[PDB]
Amino acid sequence: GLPWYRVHTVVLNDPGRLIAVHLMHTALVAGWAGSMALYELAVFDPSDPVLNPMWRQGMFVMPFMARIGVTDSWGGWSVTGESVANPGFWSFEGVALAHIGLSGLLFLAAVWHWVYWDLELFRDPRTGNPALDLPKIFGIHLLLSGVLCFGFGAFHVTGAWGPGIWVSDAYGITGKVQPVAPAWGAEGFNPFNPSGVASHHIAAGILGFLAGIFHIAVRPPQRLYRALRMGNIETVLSSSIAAVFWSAFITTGTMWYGSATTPIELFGPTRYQWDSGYFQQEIERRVENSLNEGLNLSEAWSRIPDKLAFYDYIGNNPAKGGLFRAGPMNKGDGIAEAWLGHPIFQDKEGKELTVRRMPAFFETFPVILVDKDGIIRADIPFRRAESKYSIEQVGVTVSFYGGKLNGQVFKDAPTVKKYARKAQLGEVLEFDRTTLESDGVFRSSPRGWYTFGHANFALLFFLGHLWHGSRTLFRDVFSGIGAEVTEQVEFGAFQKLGDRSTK
C-alpha cells in the first residue's frame, strides 16, 4: 500500500483535509509556544537582571516576547528590572494562555475541517474535481501578508498603536521597549539601526499589498504555468521550503553576528564582542576618562557598572558551550553573585602585567602574563624545573580595584596565581555553584542554540527543497520510466535533447 514515508500524501489532493492538517500543525505550534512560556515562567528567576539576566537562565522563547513588547509579568516584575504595579493582560502569562487557547481553537477547527471536507469551495466549477486556484490564493495570502507587515511596521513597531520594540544602547546597559520612528534612507539599512525595522515593515508591507493586488488580478502566463507546474501544489511546497531555508539562514546570520533585532541583554553577547574586546575597550576608556577627571584607580573602577563588567567575561561567550552540555548557562560556571573588581598585576618592581585572555577556540589556555609591549614576563609553568618566567622568580602581586574585593593588595605568589587563572577568563566574578549544582563546564547562550538549530534546519530544508522541486518537476515519471525513454536517450538520435521533432 502506501509506505510509512508517503502517508501524508493522501491529503495532497484534498484541500479541505489539507486545511485540516495545517490547522492541526498550527494548533500544535501555538500550544508549544504557550507551554514553553509557562515552563520558562515556572523556572525563571526575575530577581537579579544585571548578573542573572534572562539569557543566563536558558530563556529561549521569552526574549522573543520581550523583543517586541511583552516585558511584564502578572507576578509584579519586569525583565527590565522594574517592579510592575498594575500589569495588563498582555504579560508573559497572558501571552502563554492566549497561545494555549488559540491552540485549542485551532484544534477544534482542524476537527471540523477533517470531518467536513467535501465543500463546494474546493471543487472546480469547470470540471467539478477538487482543485485550488493557487496563483490567486497566493495573491490573497500576499495581500494578507502585506497588510500585516504594514500594520506591524506602522502601528506596533512605531508605537502609534502599540508598545514599540526593544531598543538598547551600544553596550546593553540601558535597554527597554520603546517606539522607534522609521528611518527612511540609507541609515535604515544599517542592521544595527532599530529604526530600519519600522521603515522596512511599512514600505515592504506596502509593496506586498500592491503585489497582492497584482496576483489576484493578473493570471499567470501559460509559459511559466507549464514550466513551474503552477497547477501542482508541490511547486508551492518546493518554493515555500526554498524561501523558508533562505529566511532561516538570514536569521541565523543576524543571530550569530548580531543586529538591532537581537539585543545582547535578550540573547547574550556575541562571540565577536569578545574577540574584538568590545566591552574591554569600553571599560578601559571609561576608567581612562575617569582618571583624566582626577579620580584614582579605586574610584575609577568603582564607577564601572556590574552589568558592563559582566559582559566582559568569556563564560558569557556563546562560542564556549558544548553540543551536549545541556541546560542554563548558570548550570556551568554558576549563578553570578558579585564582581570582584579589576585585578591589576603589579610585578615585583611595579610594572603592570596583564594575563593574556583565553580565545574562544581553546578549551584550555596556558596562563601567561604578557608585558605592556607583550614580551612574556611571568606565567604558571607546566615544568617547574629550569623555569625562567615563574611568578616566584619574577615576583607578582594582585591589587584589586573596584568590585567587592576593592582596595585589597594580595602579594603572595599562590593568591596571585589563583587570580591569574581567573583573569585569563576576562573579568573575575563570584559564582554560586550550589543552587543548580553547577559542574564547572561552560554552556551556550540562547544565541548559540538558536544559531545551531536554525543552521541545521536551514541545511535540512535545502535538502527538502531539492527533493520537492525534483518531485514536482518529475511528476510524470514518479512510478518509473516507460519504453519511450529508450528511443530519445540514444546518442545522436535527435538533434535537440528530449525533443523528437528534431530528426
Partner 1 sequence: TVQLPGGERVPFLFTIKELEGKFSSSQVSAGTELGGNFKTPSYRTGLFLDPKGRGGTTGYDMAVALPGLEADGGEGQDELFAETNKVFQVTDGSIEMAFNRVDGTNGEFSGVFVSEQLSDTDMGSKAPKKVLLKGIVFGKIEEQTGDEDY
Partner 2 sequence: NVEYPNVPYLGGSDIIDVNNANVRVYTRLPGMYPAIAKKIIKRAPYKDINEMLEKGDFTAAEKDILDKYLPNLTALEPAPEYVIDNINNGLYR
Ligand X SMILES: CC1=CCCC(C)(C)[C@H]1/C=C/C(C)=C/C=C/C(C)=C/C=C/C=C(C)/C=C/C=C(C)/C=C/C1=C(C)CCCC1(C)C
Residues touching ligand CLA, count (CB under 6 A): 44
465-484: b or e for each residue (b if 16 or more CB lie within 10 Å)?
beebbebbeeeeeeeeeeee
Distance in angstroms (rounded) separating the CA atoms of residues 94 and 288: 47
Contact 331, 61 (CB under 8 A): no
By CB under 6 A, tell whether 249 contacts ligand CLA.
Answer: yes
Picking from 466, 20, 30, the residue whose alpha carbon sits closest to that of residue 241 is: 466
User: 421 is in the binding site of which of partner 1, ligand CLA, partner 2, none (Cβ under 5 to 8 A by kind)?
Assistant: partner 1
113 annotated to bind ligand: yes
Is 454 part of any known ligand binding site? yes
Count of beta carbons in the 10 Å neighbourhood of residue 110: 21
Question: What CA dihedral angle connects 172, 177, 183 and 187, to 10 degrees?
Answer: 10
Amino acid at 361: F
Task: Identify which range of 103-111, 348-356, 435-443, 475-483 contacts partner 1 by CB under 8 A.
Answer: 435-443
347 binds partner 2 (CB under 8 A): no
Say which entry of ligand X, partner 1, partner 2, none residue 107 contacts (CB below 5 to 8 A, set by partner kind). ligand X
C-beta of 114 vs 467, nearer to ligand CLA: 467
User: Among 153, 145, 152, 206, which Cα is nearest to 181's?
Assistant: 153
* 290: Cα separation from own chain's centroid: 36
Cα dihedral sign, 483-484-487-489: negative
Q: Is 369 in the site for partner 2 (CB under 8 A)?
A: no
Q: Max CA-CA distance within the chain?
A: 96
Q: Is there binding between residue 116 and ligand CLA (CB under 6 A)? A: no
Site for ligand CLA in 327-386 (CB under 6 A): 327-328
Return the one option of ligand X, partner 1, ligand CLA, none that residue 291 interacts with (CB less than 5 to 8 A, by type): none
Q: Is 326 in the site for ligand CLA (CB under 6 A)?
A: yes
Angle at Cα 481 formed by Cα 479 and Cα 485, nearest 5°?
160
Q: Which of 1, 91, 109 is nearest to 40 (CA)?
A: 91
CB nearer ligand X, residue 205 or residue 448: 448
**Alpha-carbon gap, residue 256 to 381, rounded angstroms:** 36
Does 390 help bind partner 2 (rule: CB under 8 A)? Answer: yes
Rounded distance between C-alpha atoms, residue 182 and residue 495, angstroms: 58
Mention every residue, 6+ apart, whose C-beta is less than 8 A from residue 193.
183, 187, 260
Binding partner of residue 108 among partner 1, ligand CLA, ligand X, none, CB cut-off 5 to 8 Å per kind: ligand X
Residue 392 interacts with, from ligand CLA, ligand X, partner 2, none (CB under 5-8 Å by kind) = partner 2
Query: Would you give the binding string for ligand X spanning residues 13-52, x where CB under 6 A is met?
Result: ---------------x--xx--x-----------------
Give the DSSP H/E element, type plus range, for residue 410.
strand 409-410
User: At closest approach, how far in Å is the CB of 364 from partner 2?
Assistant: 16
Of 105, 160, 463, 493, the one binding ligand CLA by CB under 6 A: 463
Q: Please tell me what DSSP assigns to residue 379.
A: E
Contact region with partner 2 (CB under 8 A), list: 45-53, 133-141, 351-359, 390-398: 390-398
DSSP-based three-state secondary structure for 132: coil
Please tell me the count of residues contacting partner 2 according to CB under 8 A. Answer: 13
Give which of 43, 39, 41, 42 is closest to 31, Cα–Cα: 39
- Report phi then psi at 138, rounded to 5: -65, -40
| Shortest distance (Å) from residue 442 CB to partner 1 | 5
* Closest to partner 2 by CB, 125 or 414: 414
Stretch touching partner 2 by CB under 8 A, among 52-60, 223-231, 388-396, 437-445: 388-396
When asked if residue 215 is in the footprint of ligand CLA (CB under 6 A), the reply is no
- List all residues 6 or more positions away from 246 whose beta carbon is below 8 Å from its beta carbon: none
Complex with partner 1: residue 5 or 324, whichever CB lies closer: 324
**What are 466's three cell numbers?**
531539492
Alpha-carbon distance of 77 to 84, in angstroms, equals 5
Amino acid identity, position 363:
E
Cell triple for 482: 516507460
Taking CB within 5 to 8 Å according to partner kind, which of partner 2, ligand X, ligand CLA, none is near residue 449? ligand CLA
| Among positions 286, 387, 422, 455, the unique one binding partner 2 when judged by CB under 8 A | 387
Contacts (Cβ under 8 Å, ≥6 apart) of 287:
297, 300, 301, 303, 304, 342
Dihedral sign computed on CA atoms, order 92, 95, 98, 99: negative
Footprint of ligand X on 96-115 (CB under 6 A): 100-101, 103-105, 107-108
Exactly one of 128, 294, 324, 384 binds partner 1 (CB under 8 A); which one?
Answer: 384
| 199: enclosing H helix or E strand | helix 195-217
List all residues 6 or more positions away from 352 whose beta carbon is below 8 Å from its beta carbon: 344, 345, 346, 372
Nearer to partner 1, 195 or 424 (CB): 424
| Among positions 340, 369, 378, 398, the unique one binding partner 1 when judged by CB under 8 A | 340
Residues that bind partner 1 (CB under 8 A): 315, 332-334, 340, 358, 363-364, 380, 382-385, 405, 417-419, 421-422, 425, 428-431, 433, 438-442
The binding site comprises 8, 22, 25, 67, 99, 113, 141, 152, 200-201, 215, 238, 454, 465, 467-468
Residues that bind ligand CLA (CB under 6 A): 4-9, 40, 43, 58, 60, 184, 188-189, 191, 196-197, 199-200, 203-204, 207-208, 237, 241, 246, 249-250, 254, 259, 323-324, 326-328, 446, 449-450, 453, 460-461, 463-464, 467, 471
The binding site for chlorophyll a comprises 8, 22, 25, 67, 99, 113, 141, 152, 200-201, 215, 238, 454, 465, 467-468
